[PDB]
Scaffold this active site. Structure first.
Site, PDB file in Angstrom:
ATOM      1  N   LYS A   1       0.695  -1.453   0.200  1.00 48.58           N
ATOM      2  CA  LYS A   1       0.215  -0.413   0.296  1.00 48.58           C
ATOM      3  C   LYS A   1       0.817   0.894   0.225  1.00 48.58           C
ATOM      4  CE  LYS A   1      -3.853  -2.537   2.176  1.00 48.58           C
ATOM      5  NZ  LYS A   1      -5.003  -1.771   3.369  1.00 48.58           N
ATOM      6  N   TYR A   2       2.268   1.096   0.402  1.00 44.58           N
ATOM      7  CA  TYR A   2       3.079   2.348   0.869  1.00 44.58           C
ATOM      8  C   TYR A   2       4.593   1.940   0.546  1.00 44.58           C
ATOM      9  CZ  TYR A   2      -0.727   3.177   4.059  1.00 44.58           C
ATOM     10  OH  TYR A   2      -1.977   2.838   5.152  1.00 44.58           O
TER      11      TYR A   2
ATOM     12  N   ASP B   1       2.426  -2.887  13.205  1.00 45.12           N
ATOM     13  CA  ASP B   1       2.002  -3.906  12.472  1.00 45.12           C
ATOM     14  C   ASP B   1       1.603  -5.027  12.171  1.00 45.12           C
ATOM     15  OD1 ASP B   1       0.601  -4.255   9.640  1.00 45.12           O
ATOM     16  OD2 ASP B   1       1.603  -3.793   8.550  1.00 45.12           O
TER      17      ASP B   1
ATOM     18  N   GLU C   1       7.192   0.463  -2.549  1.00 50.88           N
ATOM     19  CA  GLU C   1       7.729  -0.367  -3.876  1.00 50.88           C
ATOM     20  C   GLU C   1       8.456  -0.751  -3.240  1.00 50.88           C
ATOM     21  OE1 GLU C   1       6.394  -0.840  -8.544  1.00 50.88           O
ATOM     22  OE2 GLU C   1       7.235   1.691  -7.964  1.00 50.88           O
ATOM     23  N   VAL C   2       8.939  -2.453  -3.254  1.00 47.35           N
ATOM     24  CA  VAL C   2      10.567  -3.280  -2.970  1.00 47.35           C
ATOM     25  C   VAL C   2      10.714  -4.336  -3.865  1.00 47.35           C
ATOM     26  CG1 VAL C   2      11.339  -5.090  -0.865  1.00 47.35           C
ATOM     27  CG2 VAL C   2       9.448  -3.342  -0.429  1.00 47.35           C
TER      28      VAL C   2
ATOM     29  N   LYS D   1      13.847   0.247  -1.010  1.00 50.80           N
ATOM     30  CA  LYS D   1      11.827   0.253  -0.767  1.00 50.80           C
ATOM     31  C   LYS D   1      11.969   2.006  -1.146  1.00 50.80           C
ATOM     32  CE  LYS D   1       8.716  -0.944   3.090  1.00 50.80           C
ATOM     33  NZ  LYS D   1       8.178   0.096   4.267  1.00 50.80           N
TER      34      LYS D   1
HETATM   35  O1  LIG Z   1       9.134  -2.988   4.543  1.00 49.15           O
HETATM   36  C1  LIG Z   1      10.125  -3.162   4.654  1.00 49.15           C
HETATM   37  O2  LIG Z   1      11.457  -2.782   5.907  1.00 49.15           O
HETATM   38  C2  LIG Z   1      11.317  -4.317   4.221  1.00 49.15           C
HETATM   39  C3  LIG Z   1      12.213  -4.626   4.139  1.00 49.15           C
HETATM   40  C4  LIG Z   1      13.060  -5.874   3.714  1.00 49.15           C
HETATM   41  C5  LIG Z   1      12.044  -6.382   2.959  1.00 49.15           C
HETATM   42  C6  LIG Z   1      10.484  -6.209   2.170  1.00 49.15           C
HETATM   43  C7  LIG Z   1      10.536  -5.197   3.358  1.00 49.15           C
HETATM   44  N1  LIG Z   1      10.432  -6.674   1.899  1.00 49.15           N
HETATM   45  C8  LIG Z   1      10.666  -7.667   1.031  1.00 49.15           C
HETATM   46  N2  LIG Z   1       9.333  -8.939  -0.114  1.00 49.15           N
HETATM   47  C9  LIG Z   1       8.765  -8.788   0.063  1.00 49.15           C
HETATM   48  C10 LIG Z   1       7.773  -9.516   0.131  1.00 49.15           C
HETATM   49  C11 LIG Z   1       6.265  -9.815  -0.717  1.00 49.15           C
HETATM   50  C12 LIG Z   1       5.336  -8.290  -0.446  1.00 49.15           C
HETATM   51  C13 LIG Z   1       5.997  -6.767  -0.692  1.00 49.15           C
HETATM   52 CL1  LIG Z   1       6.235  -5.444  -0.586  1.00 49.15          CL
HETATM   53  C14 LIG Z   1       8.123  -7.212  -0.082  1.00 49.15           C
HETATM   54  C15 LIG Z   1      11.678  -8.370   1.382  1.00 49.15           C
HETATM   55  C16 LIG Z   1      12.000  -9.599   0.828  1.00 49.15           C
HETATM   56  C17 LIG Z   1      13.462  -9.672   1.056  1.00 49.15           C
HETATM   57  N3  LIG Z   1      14.556  -8.713   1.872  1.00 49.15           N
HETATM   58  C18 LIG Z   1      13.911  -7.668   2.458  1.00 49.15           C
HETATM   59  C19 LIG Z   1      12.495  -7.425   2.568  1.00 49.15           C
END
Ligand SMILES: O=C(O)c1ccc2c(c1)nc(Nc1cccc(Cl)c1)c1ccncc12
Length: 324
Positions: free
Chosen positions: A43-44, A148, A46-47, A62
């Site tokens: 929602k907030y 969260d 893109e990664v 991010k």
């Molecule tokens: O928000 C953070 O701090 C944050 C920090 C680290 C990751 C993340 C989000 N999201 C990941 N993957 C992911 C998988 C599904 C949906 C979304 Cl949006 C993200 C991810 C994957 C691999 N290593 C670190 C991360």
């Protein structure tokens, strides 16, 4: 209502700890990162899986969409630096022209929880919940609520046996008597305090969310409380904890329920935890697990274990031993 632990942490650490409105970011060099692969969208955010080019090392960028909330997330990630099982902040960059900021974090080798959680043994659950409790006891001890806590925000590399609590974009500083926004957390993990609009909540919100997560794991029911809207979410909770304990809690905190609970909310006796045991989930079930769960899933946030008290529970004795 004020928190029964860590209430004075933001007082002691002062303005330079919590005053994120006046954060001055020392931006890194954006052209030092190369984006490779989108891994997810929020929602907030893109990664993306990316590269730190001077070192050729794997990392996460991010990209974030008020300014206030970007600064909050950055200040929290700086303050939590070095903490056990908190996702490590590598940098903060932004576009030259558009000024769109990005947070650079460590890359983690996650297994998606719908796949990973059913492969867990009883010891595995004990161990990863304990690792999550180190991250929450750390951030609460520093005046911060995550708000969260849910399986998507708990990244597990099952091969390394490593855990990271991620996505601090909803996190806030705890200040005694502050009225906080109740539209936090995803619906299945929202504490009763959010569902009855009790604004003077604290760290103990994370412990309810931990409870929901833990119930998912040991009862093999994702999500445990499966409501359709915020109203139905409170009904699903009431159908387990019972309405007797609900009315004493409302009375105790002087909460009046919205008018249109009266049609949909009935009188429900407390369903015992034992009624959720089945053939398929019995592998996870012990008398210590139920007692632990029971001490997390309380209406009254002041009756829930602290992260610290939770680490001393007998349920985690196989894990403390195995670490010596
Ligand atoms: O928000 C953070 O701090 C944050 C920090 C680290 C990751 C993340 C989000 N999201 C990941 N993957 C992911 C998988 C599904 C949906 C979304 Cl949006 C993200 C991810 C994957 C691999 N290593 C670190 C991360």
């Amino acid at each position: 209502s004020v928190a029964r632990v860590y209430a004075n942490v933001n007082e002691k650490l002062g303005r330079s700890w919590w005053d994120y409105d006046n954060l001055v970011v020392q931006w890194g060099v954006q052209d030092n990162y190369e984006i490779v692969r989108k891994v997810g969208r929020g929602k907030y955010s893109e990664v993306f899986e990316s590269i730190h080019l001077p070192t050729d090392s794997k990392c996460i960028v991010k990209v974030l969409k008020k300014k206030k909330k970007i600064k909050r997330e950055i200040k929290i990630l700086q303050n939590l630096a070095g903490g056990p099982n908190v996702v490590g902040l590598l940098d903060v960059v932004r576009d030259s022209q558009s000024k769109t900021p990005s947070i650079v974090t460590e890359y983690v080798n996650n297994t998606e929880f719908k796949t990973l959680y059913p492969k867990f043994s009883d010891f595995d659950v004990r161990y990863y919940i304990f690792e999550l409790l180190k991250a929450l006891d750390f951030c609460h001890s520093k005046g911060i609520m995550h708000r969260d806590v849910k399986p998507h925000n708990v990244m597990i590399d099952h091969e390394k046996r490593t855990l990271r609590l991620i996505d601090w974009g909803l996190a806030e500083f705890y200040h005694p008597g502050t009225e906080y926004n109740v539209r936090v957390a995803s619906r299945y993990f929202k504490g009763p305090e959010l569902l009855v609009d009790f604004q003077e909540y604290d760290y103990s919100l994370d412990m309810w969310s931990l409870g929901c997560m833990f119930a998912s794991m040991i009862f093999r029911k994702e999500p445990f409380f499966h409501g359709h809207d915020n109203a139905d979410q409170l009904v699903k909770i009431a159908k387990v904890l019972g309405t007797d304990e609900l009315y004493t809690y409302l009375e105790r905190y002087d909460i009046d329920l919205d008018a249109q609970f009266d049609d949909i909310l009935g009188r429900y006796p407390r369903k015992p935890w034992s009624r959720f045991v089945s053939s398929e989930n019995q592998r996870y079930i012990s008398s210590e697990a139920i007692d632990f769960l029971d001490k997390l899933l309380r209406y009254d946030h002041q009756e829930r274990l602290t992260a610290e008290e939770a680490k001393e529970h007998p349920y985690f004795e196989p894990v403390r031993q195995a670490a010596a």
